[PDB]
């Protein structure tokens, strides 16, 4: 496909950016990149202008909860057998669809590499 | 595929963007973004880390040369049926990589929307 910097319909990007648990093995990443009352991703999914979701094996730091909504096997809990990743969605005016994309693992790797 | 934030591999992003001839009729695009001698898109790969290049009809400035290029059928020559375009190709690690076509992206859009 072409990318044509002047049209009206949007393109998307999706990234799953994994959690990178094994180089901070004590890091609350799932705490803090959701906040009290889940409002830090809201704050960064406002900001950004993307959607932001924390999803697979940890993302609802309860391994009883998980196992039961897995095993239920309801299509929506099927994200919890992926590696534990963020999921980036931009869907944005293509001269703008990189910038936003950039700005979004920008801020979203603020939370995955803490430390930098 | 996940995006692994911390990994030697390099992941490729390709974009192909049209060149805005409708919108400006008389911008001699072609010449603006190679210059002299190709030493325009010479510095702009050299500044944006990314193979840039310009492809499709158009993209010769020679009918004559393009009609017998793509008639030679020479696969090399194969772009020469293409509506005109920038073909961005980045190349990089995964933390940076989105970063670098963005910057490209910028860059490429200084000469596509040479009026903004
Ligand atoms: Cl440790
Ligand atoms: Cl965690
Ligand atoms: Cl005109
Ligand atoms: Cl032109």
Redo the contacts between chains.
């Keep these: 496909?072409?990318?044509?910097?002047?049209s009206h319909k949007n393109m998307k990007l999706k990234?799953?950016?994994?959690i990178?648990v094994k180089?901070y093995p004590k890091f609350n990443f799932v705490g803090k990149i959701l906040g009290p009352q889940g409002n830090t991703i809201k704050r960064l999914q406002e900001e950004t202008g993307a959607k932001i979701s924390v999803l697979g094996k940890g993302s609802m730091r309860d391994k009883a909860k998980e196992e039961e909504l897995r095993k239920g096997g309801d299509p929506k809990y099927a994200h919890l057998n992926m590696?534990l990743?963020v999921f980036i969605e931009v869907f944005g005016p293509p001269?703008e669809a990189?910038?936003l994309?950039?700005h979004a693992?920008?801020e979203v790797?603020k939370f995955?590499?803490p430390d930098m």
Tied chains: 1, 2.
């Design positions: 496909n072409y990318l044509d910097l002047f990234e799953r950016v994994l990178p180089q590696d990743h001269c990189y910038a994309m950039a693992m920008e790797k995955l590499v």
